[PDB]
Amino acid sequence: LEPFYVERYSWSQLKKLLADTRKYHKAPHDFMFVKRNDPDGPHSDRIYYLAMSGENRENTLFYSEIPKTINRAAVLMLSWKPLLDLVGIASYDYHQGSGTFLFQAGSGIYHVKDGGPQGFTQQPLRPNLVETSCPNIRMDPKLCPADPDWIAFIHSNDIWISNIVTREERRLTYVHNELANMEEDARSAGVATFVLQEEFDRYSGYWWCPKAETTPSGGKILRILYEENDESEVEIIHVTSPMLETRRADSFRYPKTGTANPKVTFKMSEIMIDAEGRIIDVIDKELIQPFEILFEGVEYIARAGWTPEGKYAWSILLDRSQTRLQIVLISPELFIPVEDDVMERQRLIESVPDSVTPLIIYEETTDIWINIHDIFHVFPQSHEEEIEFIFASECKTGFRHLYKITSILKESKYKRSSGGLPAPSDFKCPIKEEIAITSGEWEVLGRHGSNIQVDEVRRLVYFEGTKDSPLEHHLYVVSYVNPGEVTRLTDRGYSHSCCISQHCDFFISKYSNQKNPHCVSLYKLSSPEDDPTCKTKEFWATILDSAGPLPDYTPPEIFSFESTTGFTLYGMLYKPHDLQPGKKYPTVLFIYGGPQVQLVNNRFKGVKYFRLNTLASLGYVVVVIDNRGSCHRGLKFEGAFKYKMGQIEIDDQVEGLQYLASRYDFIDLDRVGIHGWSYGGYLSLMALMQRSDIFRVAIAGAPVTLWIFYDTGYTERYMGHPDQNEQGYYLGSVAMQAEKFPSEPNRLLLLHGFLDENVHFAHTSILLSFLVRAGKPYDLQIYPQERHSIRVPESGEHYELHLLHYLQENLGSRIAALKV
Amino acid sequence: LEPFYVERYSWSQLKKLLADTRKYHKAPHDFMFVKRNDPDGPHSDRIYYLAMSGENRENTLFYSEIPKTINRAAVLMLSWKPLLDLFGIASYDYHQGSGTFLFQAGSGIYHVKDGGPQGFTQQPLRPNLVETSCPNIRMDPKLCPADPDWIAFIHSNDIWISNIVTREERRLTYVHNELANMEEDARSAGVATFVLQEEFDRYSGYWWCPKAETTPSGGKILRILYEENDESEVEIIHVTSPMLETRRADSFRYPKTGTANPKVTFKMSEIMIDAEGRIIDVIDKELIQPFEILFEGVEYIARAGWTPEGKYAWSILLDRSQTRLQIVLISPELFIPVEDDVMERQRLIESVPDSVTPLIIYEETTDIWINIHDIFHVFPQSHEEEIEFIFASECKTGFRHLYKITSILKESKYKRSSGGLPAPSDFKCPIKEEIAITSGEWEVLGRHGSNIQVDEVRRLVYFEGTKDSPLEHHLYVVSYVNPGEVTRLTDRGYSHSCCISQHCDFFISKYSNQKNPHCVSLYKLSSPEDDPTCKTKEFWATILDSAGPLPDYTPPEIFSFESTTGFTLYGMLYKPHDLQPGKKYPTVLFIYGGPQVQLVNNRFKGVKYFRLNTLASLGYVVVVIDNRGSCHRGLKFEGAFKYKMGQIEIDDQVEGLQYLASRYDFIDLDRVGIHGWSYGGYLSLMALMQRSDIFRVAIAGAPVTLWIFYDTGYTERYMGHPDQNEQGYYLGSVAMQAEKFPSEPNRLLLLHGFLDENVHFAHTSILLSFLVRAGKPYDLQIYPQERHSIRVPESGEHYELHLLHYLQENLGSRIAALKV
């Protein structure tokens, strides 16, 4: 069986090849339905959404008209109507009673009105700048749901509010100083700190109370819950400033694993507004006892918000190890004004009843980890001493499922005036009811936009899950009263990502598969008159048509194999284009292989993984395998590498590789390469360390080389604290095992964005430090202008060019074979 | 001619080859002569000196006995007797009258006596630790020459003094606070700042007055001249900290070319002491008028000290462009106490006479630049109206020569009482006499320890120079009264580094040549009875013996050629070992090429440049050429590249390369590589950029890629201010011309110490950013533990390993030909 050697192009020629194939190459999202309520008009709804409409175009608001009826013989294509007059807009708020949109576009915060009592526009509206006296950029703007005249935003790590008709502007928090350096002033209000944004996907740190309390004089009280962080004890790291001329570095509060997270607490801003819409006074309030006493054991505020009527604030709270989750109701009466005078302050503590107390309405544990999600729905309060809610969890069965829970709002055993600390269980509510709404060997999805929509009239819950296949996401519906069978609403053969109307009579799906690029289509939901539980769908219109099967892109084929570990493991195979019979080709394993990611599924890969096809076209077999630890296969599948990251993943990659090599004799196992970014770079190094017999070259992008360098939230989920897993951290850190790398050159390539604040460059430089100490060869490429991703096209072009040339010169071509 | 190809050794074989050739592998310095004064004893002198006894041992004081007579049939090897037994030392201080040594060894400052009234030890001495209350490390200790009980030192950028018998310890300056961080507190006293240490080789910023003024009470006043620096307006730069696990950078005051140098002034500390050694008071004193007014146009305090009688402080002052030098006498009466009260301060200003004024006893200019040196001898004052001194200069002829000068210390035309400002020439002293002691097309040496020694009895001056050859330094002697014949004292055929005993009856030479490793020998000076002016020498004893003609080292041969530019240029050629007939070999140009350095001379290159021989043993031609700009050829030769660094150097390299190619068939001009560090790395990049027709590969170490990033003292000397040389700065900066690099890979290797504070790593990172932008390929090696030098052995070994392997794979071997 003869070895195929790839065509040996020059650097200039490969640049041309890449530029030519690139030359040919954002979908609508954040949908919202608003009813017309016009009996004579032809339209039932107007949908609003964010999209581009061009390769080089700002992301902006559009609308389309949903007609009451359609021509069912034809296919309706909805025209995109620009909502606004002339990157861009990333998200938007809406208040339905008034029609007020609010959004940030560049530095400015703007608002328009459509769909309210004002009616529906037929032409682009003019964005109205919310004026300000704040010198710096305003971040994270939110409408007050109780009063759409008021917004809030962050300026220099403090909370501000601004009235968009009276033009009044007030600062609510005085925690940060814009003029002081960060080393001395490390406190913020209303802002999620690094670990929360990066490792829990919480981006805001303040929440409007959705209802206004009326006052005696005919005014009102608006309310804002917010987290206040003190990062004074968090370690300070320096990362190189993008302006390389300065030869300077930015300071950065980075809680590395096994060191202090920020000191956190809850606060409440109480804004008194008079009859004319003007601020009487602002009273800043704090918890009656400190956070550590009321919420024992809690490290992270994972999520937060309010109940629909604004009676209680809620929060989802994690312990340090992230094996215990608590859902806690927090009353506004737990908050007292911040007081310097101890005499007046002691009176305010004694004035608040002992009956007012935190209410832990739910608690769960696991000995794997808590995966945080966005599913949490709270029904209206039927009775004063009860609360009903839907939550999702992997803790019961090891797959994420929905549960309808009723908890009893009991007065606590603990009395505050007695002058003691509460026992752990004193705030725990008892569980009256806990019904499993779903179950099986498959999960409900709750991250990255996936959530539930609850029809309260027909008593149903729409959700996304993996019930039909782990390679496809689908829309499902089921009753939450008499949970029986689960009706799938999307068609098989594509993977779907869906949005359901607030009115529960429509859903939109963005869908694709390996062959076809992503589509976006609208579907009307119907039920037969005799049974509202039973749900059917009908195609209504196309929002975004697929480009169709692209020329010069051959998709891969999805394979599987029964692993010796007792799991089916899936993969993607790109056959090298124009197979010559009786010839064996060089192979390139592309890998990520860490938690919270699945690379192998029935989705279009011709956008993001286009260069895998380019490798196939030059004569490389390309393989991708989701090893144990990847998502969408349940908690036990995910848990396989708890305490043991780096030890198992390459066994699955090799087992899958050898499966393919037996069934396909065109795979040359003497010329295999491995490449990945972040965790993929990490495993690319482990592959070369552990299995140098199988892997000739390894190309590691932004690799974790040393787990002690990575943050608290991520590293302690999967590896625990470093003091209690000394062997796991050692075996999982490539920089502590530099002697295991080859003494042969032209096998190791390290790639790194120099400005990376996520996986610090330090990971690479310390690896290099030990490789140099151990007399080991390496190749290195730096991207001086890039962080963790590659954003500037020139850097990405150079990356791809160097990668192809490296694979050619050290793996694929005939000159590569001669170098040994 | 058939092409020779070097053997393809593996990475492991090359490591072994480098380790075997290394397996077989700091001379005596800082000499001092002390007379025995023992008529009955066998020894005339004891010599003390710093050295390293073994390979891995520390640097300490030793001594040897100089006998009154010698067996002239035999060769006396002096035995090294350890002075200390410490339960290291970079320098020491000594007081003749008392016999007190003072030195720093590690964190401690020590004192111990030998060779005065207390006698001469016959075994190692255990030193006495100086007591302190200071928490941080103490720097730059100096004995008071007027009282060996008193020492000074620096602690946290302020001057302290302490008494080694009474144990009194007083802080003299209150200019820096260690508690406040670097960003806000930028003042220091007694310390030379960055630029003056790197670019002017001044390491101290305070000078003891050599004499004590007696008080009528019975005590005395001791004085310390010092410079006070304010670095507030100097730019702050961040350099990666050596502890890579911290992921932090350290702050550094780095005055980049075209920006503010430190604000500098002179101060005077007056220490009043009572009759029995106790301090009475300390008065800190400042200049009567500001530094800028008294010393118009002066940027740099290049050198400073006192006249031997202690009457005047002196200073050598440069303007910003470093084309004007002034020697200035500064009376203690020009200093007044520092006063807050403005009325009491104006009393003190008026209490100083108008006759007391700064005295500019010498001034010179040049169209090239002033090279600062350490030669300045002031004779005793016979008349109070006159000062006689010897100074050296290149400004008269273009070569450095000694001049005896007499200046009239006149009363100035400027009066302070008049209430105006002094004009430029008001402080200039008229020149009574200016005799040239030496002359010719050759230079006197005044840097790196080269200096003069004056014999005031015989009226002679000993010096070092290039008179006999620019490839050899030799010791000479000449009269300063009736200068004529210059008598060489060292033997032709070696290059010498010498020092003369204070008593002018002995000199020591460290000498070597191309064939023989370095030796150190003692020679006795004497005169014939008929003429004290005449000096002869005789070999007395060896201090450090030769290793002998070194096994497995083959030295190069020095050559020269008559350049088209009108100068003879010198070079070194390493012929390949086992030179086959009718074959041509790959060539490696090693380069520095910047100012203040000469690579080609008659010295042993088998230690520092041992690996050039190793390259020749593998079959490489190695060439080194001293292009125009290199030192030891006069100021006109050196000035060739003024305003245009990087534009002329490679022309000379290539001319010398073509000269060798026409005279030797074995040089294969199709396979020429270039390599150097610092300025050599810079020129290696320029070589590939400008002349890719000549040079196949370039290995750039710590390269200056961008002259705006380099400091004031160096860059502005050679290139002027950036506004006055926009094109020279552009053309001289390789990062600004990234498009000129090759589109072929395997031609450019970048080497850089990651922690380099001198040539910042940003030179590389910025070059790489432009190379990425221009789609150009590069190879990169980082040394994460190294600064500008490569100190840690592992880093050095890896560098040598990787460089050999790179040259093999991309220049020398058969695979290198097939790669193109």
Tell me the CATH number at A485. 2.140.10.30
Residue in chain A lying closest to B759 (CA): A247
Q: How many CB pairs under 8 A join A and B?
A: 116
CA of residue A776 relative to chain centroid, distance: 38
Shortest Cα distance from A785 to chain B (angstroms)? 7
Which residue, among A247, A798, A806, would best test binding to B if mutated, counting the most B CBs under 10 Å from its CB?
A247
Shortest Cα distance from B820 to chain A (angstroms)? 9
Contacts of B805 in chain A (CB under 8 A): 745, 777
Q: Could you give the angle at the alpha carbon of A723 between the alpha carbons of A722 and A729, nearest 5°?
A: 35
Residue in chain A lying closest to B784 (CA): A769
Q: A819 vs B815: CB contact, 8 Å cut-off?
A: yes
CB B670 within 8 A of CB B812: no
Is residue A90 packed enough to be buried (19+ CB in 10 Å), middle (13-18) or exposed (0-12)?
exposed
Query: Residue B406: CB partners within 8 Å, gap ≥ 6?
Result: B386, B387, B388, B431, B432, B433, B434
Q: Provide the token pair at B413.
A: 């035309």
**In sequence order, which ranges of B691-759 are alpha helices (DSSP H)?**
712-719, 726-731
CA distance B268 to A256: 50
| Resolution value (Å, 1 decimal) | 2.5
| Pick from B10, B782, B798: CB nearest A780 | B782
Radius of gyration, alpha carbons of chain A: 28
Q: Please check whether residue B247 touches A, CB under 8 A.
A: yes
Q: Please check whether residue A219 touches B, CB under 8 A.
A: no
The end-to-end CA distance of chain B, in Å, is 20
Contacts of B258 in chain A (CB under 8 A): none
Q: B762 vs A244: CB contact, 8 Å cut-off?
A: yes
Helices and strands (DSSP H and E) totals, chain B: 13, 46
Q: Provide the token pair at B758.
A: 């001198």
Q: Provide the token pair at A438.
A: 């779903």
Q: List b or e across A256-290, with b for residues whose CB sees 16 or more CB atoms inside 10 angstroms.
A: bbbeebbbbbbbbbbbbbeeeeebeebebbbbbee
CA distance B160 to A595: 60
Element (H, E) at A226: strand A220-230
CA distance B336 to B284: 8
Q: B772 vs A780: CB contact, 8 Å cut-off?
A: no
Residue B468 β-bridge partners = none
| Pick from A248, A779, A784: CB nearest B765 | A784
Contacts of A754 in chain B (CB under 8 A): 765
Residues 157-216 of A with CB under 8 A from B: 181, 183
| Pick from A239, A777, A782: CB nearest B765 | A782
CA distance B285 to A338: 53
Contacts of A766 in chain B (CB under 8 A): 244-245, 784
Q: A794 vs B772: CB contact, 8 Å cut-off?
A: yes
Q: A780 vs B781: CB contact, 8 Å cut-off?
A: yes
Q: B249 vs A238: CB contact, 8 Å cut-off?
A: yes
Query: Residue A609: CB partners within 8 Å, gap ≥ 6?
Result: A590
Sheet holding B313-319, edge to edge: B298-306, B313-319, B324-330, B359-365
Which of B30, B67, B83, B87 shows the shortest CA–CA distance to B540? B67
Sheet holding B147-155, edge to edge: B138-144, B147-155, B158-163, B169-171
Contacts of A818 in chain B (CB under 8 A): 815, 818
Element (H, E) at B562: strand B557-562
Contacts of B778 in chain A (CB under 8 A): 781
Which one from A678, A684, A733, A813 is the annotated catalytic residue? A678
| Pick from A240, A708, A768: CB nearest B782 | A768
* The residue to which tokens 């020491």 are assigned: B92
Contacts of A743 in chain B (CB under 8 A): 10-12, 15
Which one from A756, A760, A763, A813 is the annotated catalytic residue? A756
> Helix, strand, coil shares of chain A as percentages rounded to 5?
20, 35, 45
Q: Please check whether residue B248 touches A, CB under 8 A.
A: yes
CA distance B812 to B7: 8
Residue type for position B313:
A
Element (H, E) at B660: helix B649-663
* The residue to which tokens 């008392």 are assigned: B98
Q: State yes or no: is A185 an active-site residue.
A: no
Q: Please check whether residue B245 touches A, CB under 8 A.
A: yes
Which of B198, B226, B62 shows the shortest CA–CA distance to B140? B226
Q: Residue A92 is part of which domain span?
A: 29-544
Element (H, E) at B638: helix B635-639
Query: Residue A19: CB partners within 8 Å, gap ≥ 6?
Result: A797
Which of B168, B227, B171 shows the shortest CA–CA distance to B195? B227
Q: State yes or no: is A30 an active-site residue.
A: no
CB B764 within 8 A of CB B750: yes
* Longest Cα separation, chain B: 91
Contacts of A805 in chain B (CB under 8 A): 745, 777
Contacts of B819 in chain A (CB under 8 A): 815
Q: A745 vs B775: CB contact, 8 Å cut-off?
A: no
Q: B744 vs A784: CB contact, 8 Å cut-off?
A: no
CB A1 within 8 A of CB A665: yes
Which one from B162, B756, B760, B813 is the annotated catalytic residue? B756
Q: Are strands A697-701 and B386-393 parallel, antiparallel or unpaired?
A: unpaired
Q: B238 vs A249: CB contact, 8 Å cut-off?
A: yes
Which of A814, A815, A749 shows the shortest CA–CA distance to A779? A749
Write out A335-377 in H/E/C secondary structure. EEECCCCHHHHHHHHHHCCCCCCCEEEEEEECCCCCCCCCCEE
Residues 579-638 of B with CB under 8 A from A: none
Which of A689, A773, A695 shows the shortest CA–CA distance to A730? A689
Q: Provide the token pair at B580.
A: 């086959």
Element (H, E) at B603: none
Which residue, among B741, B772, B790, would best test binding to A if mutated, counting the most A CBs under 10 Å from its CB?
B772
CA distance A645 to A310: 43
Residue in chain A lying closest to B10 (CA): A744
Q: What are phi and psi of B775, to 5 degrees?
A: 60, 30
Shortest Cα distance from B681 to chain A (angstroms)? 19
**In sequence order, which ranges of A581-630 are alpha helices (DSSP H)?**
610-618
Which one from B156, B630, B678, B684 is the annotated catalytic residue? B678
Q: Please check whether residue B13 touches A, CB under 8 A.
A: no
Q: Please check whether residue A785 touches B, CB under 8 A.
A: yes
CA distance A161 to A141: 9
CA distance A486 to B708: 69
Contacts of B818 in chain A (CB under 8 A): 815, 818
Query: Residue B756: CB partners within 8 Å, gap ≥ 6?
Result: B239, B702, B786, B787, B788
Residues 73-102 of B with CB under 8 A from A: none
CA distance B159 to A205: 51
| Pick from A237, A797, A798: CB nearest B247 | A237
**C-alpha torsion angle, residues A390, A392, A395, A398 (rounded to 10):** 140
Residue type for position B38:
D
Contacts of B254 in chain A (CB under 8 A): 247
Q: Are strands B220-230 and B204-208 parallel, antiparallel or unpaired?
A: antiparallel
- At A281 the three-state DSSP class reads strand
CA distance A310 to B638: 82
Q: State yes or no: is B12 an active-site residue.
A: no
Count other Cβ atoms within 10 Å, centred on residue B660: 20
Method: X-ray
CA distance A308 to A495: 33
* Longest Cα separation, chain A: 92
CA distance A609 to A615: 10
CA distance A467 to A510: 18
CA distance A477 to A494: 18
Residue B712's Cβ-side half-sphere holds a number of Cα atoms within 13 Å equal to 23
Residue in chain B lying closest to A759 (CA): B247
Residues 689-748 of A with CB under 8 A from B: 708-709, 743-745
CB A221 within 8 A of CB A273: yes
Which of B648, B641, B729, B738 shows the shortest CA–CA distance to B689? B738
Query: Residue B740: CB partners within 8 Å, gap ≥ 6?
Result: B689, B690
Q: What is the DSSP string of B140-174?
A: EEEEETTEEEEEEEEETTEEEEEETTT--EEE---
Q: Please check whether residue B22 touches A, CB under 8 A.
A: no
Residue in chain A lying closest to B773 (CA): A794
